[PDB]
């Protein structure tokens, strides 16, 4: 809703003027298409000044999440990630994807990591293909998480076997964020 | 429905009197429980005289199918299988399961073979377990079919990759049945 | 419903005592299983006296219809077919399937013939398999109809292209029945 | 529901012992199959004594109705028709179908006649086929009504164009029944 | 369904006469109530001769499962268990619950073990109670499984963490059954 | 289901012959009416021999429960109670309602006690009336439980505030049952 | 459910032999028709011996209730009423309707009284008619209650204004029952 | 809805110009994302002047609530909280989250506090994880409430066990607000 | 809908310019949030000129109503209340809430007062809490109505027990409004 | 969503200003119509400068995809294709459709190829037409893919038989893209 | 969606400025009303310059299609038609309706022709009317197609009997289009 005095912007458009992108929902193709577009727009405006990506997300589509991930890495500006409330699943993956030294969480924000979810129906052969695909997707996720946290692939595999809830400080120790933001 | 003069039976009960079992529906646990019980009852009545199993089935549960299969092989009496209309999937598997030299189909009956169907939802690990299980189930089915038709495992695998419709004569040629019954 | 004095039978069970089978519904696997069982029962009672099959059916499953068809041709007794009301699609096929010289329709009974109906969904390859199967099923149906009516395969093909409604006398002229029963 | 002392009959089965058949529902394939079976049974019991058919029906399937109609005309015993409550559409057709001089209605029973109802969907050609069939069905109905009432085909066509409600005495005047039964 | 000549029994009632109980469905309170009643009845008939329990079940209610388990252990007769098709979850628990030396599976029967499933909704305190209860239930199940298989509690805990499918021979090696029945 | 040889009984009717009543479902007005009727019938047969009430129930209607409770206390024969599987809520109330010294649970049976559940909608005055009623109902339940277990009203109140799951031995210590049955 | 040894009765049929009628459900036309029929049957069997009506009911239809009420008052035998569980609304009305000196409740049975419930929709004139009818119905109910309890009409009106729950002893004090049955 | 003369604002946008944020709905990710964005915007406009947060909320998502909470504590401007109507659950938490000495409620506004609500479904292990998580979340909430009210953790625990409704003055006495606003 | 010439407003925004607020719906959180915001906006524009609140409402949420109530009493400007059509329940409460001497109703407008409505489900303890809450809410509502009408608390309690419809002149006599507006 | 400072655009409109088109949804007629219009618009603005088409799509309508495909090939400007997240089915076809040398995917983007999906229902003849159409559509798709990747038609047919998932580098090796974009 | 810089247009409005109309949906009254209005608008702007109608449509309402058809023929400017993706049924009719020498299809666009589809329900007379109307509608469509393609009516009738899919070059050979657009 709320409109801002300046021409007329909605609140998010006004923040986008200050290079702030707000991810505050589940990740699907629509949401990814919007986040990618905002990142490309901000690079075009200024390729030097960094971007601030606030994250409050239960996660969602892995492929949509990778559209965001790859765009973050491709563009020249540093992308700062700030976790507010919760960054779960692919949300926490994008949190760990921020520029090195510039990944943050607020003191009471939660971070959850687990293995990818999916489905498969039909012939045994079809199920085999879907199983191989999600397993390969998990390997891809775990490899990247390994490089970004400093944890081994085998540890990531083990720590994501079931829902793993982390406090902001635990997320810092884990290597998912660099610092927890103390009240200013 | 129909009642029969003798005490009062239904039409299927009267046929069971002559050691005839009618499988004329999809295969589930209820149906399997009924067929298995009929097979055990007939063995108890006479362990020497053979049993006649008419099959008109689109298939269904593989485990329920194996309850019937294993009961057929365990009991002393020969179980003759007679395909009428259609024996598809687990239906055709049970057709091939009849006593050697005593597997029949009527001239216009259809026989369909394909790979098992299933589902999987949840974590990547859970999907992997479900995929490995259906693949092992397919291997079990193909190995037994191999022994009962004389076909190589590779040929069974190839022929069951997609829906494979067979005429009565083709089913005989394949080794799924022994003889197509000529009008008496 | 109604019960008959003799032990207690339902009306259809009393008619079965006189070797009469009533087909007054759509053809599915349940109905086919019942008709087949009645035919097998009557043959076991007396393999010499003929059977009377009344037909009032819109049709239904082709495979279920063939279970009945093949059983009619396999058993020793002549199966008389009598169309009352309507024999449509697979119903009319079973009407034409009666013993030669013993296929009847009442003066106002209707007979309808058309090509088989079906469905297909999924991959192009899967749709191809389903298309070939229903086309081969049509060829099988037309070949048998040709043999039983005296009409050519090419004429059956043309006349079944769309819904083809025939009066009792037209059905006699076509060769689907032998005689229209005059009031006694 | 109610059971009768004799063995145990339901109320309709006891009435069938006295050669009374009750039609008190819509006419479909199930009902027609039961009525026809009852008519064939009673003839087999005694082919000389007449049968009493009570009719309280809103009509239903034309083809199912013709199964009943032709069976009435085929069997040797006279079939008396007695309208109670309402005989509408195909119900009034079966009322007029009773043995000549033996078609009755109670003083406050209603009789309705109209043209057949149906449907058509799909291609223009398909709609044409369904239109021709229903028109030919109406001709058949109007022709038979002509023979049984004494009214011309042209008058029937006009009188059945819309819903036509007739009192017991009007139905006698029309030739649908022979006599309205006076209280005994 | 089918009736048997003797008075009139259904097929399962006839098998009960020979001290055979058929469990061929999901385990709920109704099924448990029936199995318990059959076990109590058979002991009252003869407390010396053993009982035969056929199991084809995907499992179900743990408490309903224990009603059957405790009745098996309480009564004097030996309860032989025979797996046909599948014994999954609480079904496999009951399979292992048979008299020592008298637990069987047919060659192609499947056995699946895993941890109990449940749900909890409401206040944090209410969720805690439900969590403690299901955890205590799992401990109870694992302890009994340990005593009946010979496996350690720690191994049971590990092997039941996820869906664990076992062949008949694997189930024997595990100690869930004593012998795989070879065709007679 | 299963029928028993003697005339024909169902399995529960045969057990009723031996003064055994099976409660294996939720408690509602229908079930209570059946249990009450069985208790009255058994007293009429023999007022001296005791009755055996097996209980596997999650509970249900309090008023229906009290219909059973009051009938148990009114009739002259001792009503033995035996918990199998689970006696929860009103189910455990009826368990404790058995004749003193004759209340049992099998070793793995569970017992759950909690406060009654209900609802209220409408005017504040109406809500007040419904609230007072359920509170008074709880007082009645607690008072009777106190008389039958020996535990104070205040302890019962505290112990039933939330779902309280008890093992068989814990139920014995609590005074809900007199003894846990050891395998015979 | 349960069957009883004697021929075969259900449990309620066996109790009816001892002149016991069980009302254990909501009161509708079906239930009323059954209760009325049982009262008439018992009078025809013996017009001198009294009848025992057990009541466990939340009430229901007022007119259905009056069918039972008027039949109680018409027949010669005394109708003893025994409340078990709950007698609410029209249930409590029938409880008070028993023979004087012979109206009972078990110690923990509940009794609830309130005003009749209903609905009206349509024109203001139609709503007026429905309101006048339900008000007159209440006056009819309150008068009879006054005659049967001994309380003034004004007190009944005041006490039935809202849901009024009464214990067995309060129901005795009020005059709804004559005596609370002490355990025998 | 309503538009305001100035460019065109909606009513809430015009209030945002005066640094007023309205929370008048349930708390979810969408609402939290909006409130956070409004807080960040107002800080960017003026980091010295305090912000006014009106709260009329039944609560909602805990993590969404913490996104708002942490943003309140992070930004430099004081955030005044004003309860109108109701602040329940997470709503009351955010009310207590306002700058010290600047937390208000209007005289008739209600404040409700209780423990967090949630769910858990699946394996016992999964239920355990979900239970531990909600228990830890409650500990976090109670600790923060302790710091902001002055009440001990033990008292907060006891007071939030069930729904606890407080008047504006009771909320001041409890330490949830600083002052109840007297009419100006 | 309709737009107004000036910039472009809707019909309600143009009236808001003249300090007129239209309450023409049920009272929920969304409506309350809008009304409150309009009252805060108009005070900021001019804290001296009085506001005109037209009320046509069936009532709604009590808490939402109090958000409007307290905002009316808090702000400096007199809030005139004008009933058009109907002010029922919380709508009539807000009508009485207007500035003394400045509460109006048009001659044919209706005013209805009754007690608050609510619902409760769950444990007896939970029902008790909900019952106490709605009773305390009624006391608060009645106390305020007593102060604003001049009627005693006991009279308000008695008059609000059931739906109490008042004409404009009866509402004036009662003290809910000050004057009924005569046509100008 | 978000608005951009310049007049007011949405984020996608501002990107279109830089000749960037975002495909971030399934492909249907609406989406195709939008993409085609944007391609035609950009050609009209400048026919020399190339266009950037970002693709994140699971595919969809083949015909809608060909509308986009043919428009890409018709216009003068080169259309660069960049895969982010996933290009599946018709999505991967459009990725391969980009100007030669200018087809890209980001390092973690996925590419999936398979055969077209469809459905058919009705007469055997109608199913044949639908099967022939989808087979010819697949031939068209495979022929174009052959031209654009450099792979043989025989290989494409084989590789597209089932779901075939490719990494960005595998897609390059296959010839679906020219280069995987390394982070800038 | 997308907005264009100039005032603000949507992408289709900007194309309309260049006399381009986009038909990219099913044809109904709403779409027809929009297309007709656009054609009328463009004629008013310039009656000499030709109009460009892009067609991607599966067809729809015949009457709505004729509203477009007749408007195309009425207006003075030439209407160029361009098929992209698919022109099916009434879509292909409008494609052939373009100015002669100026009807186009892109190389991979599909064209489908068949007979009109409809439905009829009710009396035989009503079905006759509906059948005659759709048959007359087909004659109108076939006559116009004959004029615009150069094919005989008898050939059109034969070719539209069933779904007839055509490639772009087949559509040119047929006379439905003049030229297939080669890439520019």
């Amino acid at each position: 809703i709320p409109t801002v005095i300046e021409r007329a912007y909605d609140i998010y458009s006004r923040l986008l003027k200050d290079r702030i992108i707000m991810l505050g929902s589940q990740i699907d193709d629509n949401v990814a298409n919007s986040i990618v577009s905002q990142l490309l727009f901000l690079q075009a405006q200024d390729s030097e000044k960094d971007i601030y990506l606030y994250i409050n997300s239960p996660g969602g589509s892995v492929t949509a999440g990778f559209a965001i991930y790859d765009t973050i890495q491709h563009i020249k500006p540093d992308v700062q990630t700030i976790c507010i409330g919760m960054a779960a699943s692919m949300g926490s993956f994008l949190l760990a994807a921020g520029a090195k030294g510039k990944r943050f969480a607020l003191p009471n924000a939660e971070v959850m990591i687990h293995q990818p979810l999916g489905g498969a129906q039909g012939q045994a052969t079809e199920i085999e293909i879907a199983a191989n695909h999600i397993l390969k997707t998990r390997e891809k996720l775990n490899r990247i998480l390994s490089e970004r946290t400093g944890q081994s692939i085998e540890k990531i595999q083990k720590d994501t076997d079931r829902d793993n809830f982390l406090t902001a400080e635990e997320a810092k120790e884990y290597g998912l964020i660099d610092e927890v933001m103390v009240p200013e």
Side-chain angles (χ1 to χ4, degrees), chain A:
Chain A
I1 9 164
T3 309
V4 159
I5 169 175
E6 209 82 20
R7 292 205 175 203
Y9 309 95
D10 63 277
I11 198 83
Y12 305 112
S13 308
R14 179 62 187 87
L15 261 50
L16 187 65
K17 190 190 163 74
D18 294 338
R19 303 179 73 79
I20 298 167
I21 302 166
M22 302 296 293
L23 173 58
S25 65
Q26 81 299 320
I27 302 162
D28 57 38
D29 287 344
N30 284 323
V31 170
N33 198 220
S34 182
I35 303 286
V36 168
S37 295
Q38 293 175 69
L39 286 163
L40 292 176
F41 166 72
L42 289 175
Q43 187 196 35
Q45 294 283 290
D46 198 308
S47 60
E48 309 306 311
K49 294 184 188 181
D50 32 52
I51 297 158
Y52 305 88
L53 175 62
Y54 281 85
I55 299 164
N56 184 24
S57 177
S61 168
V62 175
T63 60
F66 270 118
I68 297 171
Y69 175 87
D70 275 358
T71 304
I72 287 169
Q73 313 316 143
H74 180 254
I75 61 167
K76 201 188 179 183
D78 284 355
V79 180
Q80 302 198 26
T81 51
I82 307 149
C83 180
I84 56 168
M86 168 73 86
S89 186
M90 197 58 40
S92 64
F93 186 80
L94 291 180
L95 178 62
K100 285 189 174 291
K102 292 174 181 183
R103 303 166 302 168
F104 303 99
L106 290 189
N108 296 112
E110 286 189 334
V111 179
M112 189 272 280
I113 56 168
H114 66 196
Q115 54 173 130
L117 301 165
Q121 204 167 18
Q123 296 180 301
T125 283
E126 294 175 312
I127 294 164
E128 185 181 31
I129 288 161
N132 287 334
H133 178 238
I134 196 166
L135 289 169
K136 197 171 189 185
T137 297
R138 189 183 184 193
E139 283 185 14
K140 183 166 77 174
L141 288 163
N142 291 358
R143 190 192 65 252
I144 294 168
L145 263 186
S146 178
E147 263 88 293
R148 297 205 144 272
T149 58
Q151 310 291 355
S152 74
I153 288 161
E154 311 89 75
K155 181 166 165 63
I156 297 294
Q157 175 80 352
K158 199 168 281 168
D159 290 350
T160 57
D161 185 56
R162 255 65 144 86
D163 281 6
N164 204 160
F165 292 95
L166 277 70
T167 61
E169 289 204 10
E170 285 166 337
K172 183 190 175 188
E173 177 78 300
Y174 205 81
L176 290 164
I177 55 164
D178 302 299
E179 195 62 64
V180 17
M181 300 215 299
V182 65
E184 187 192 343

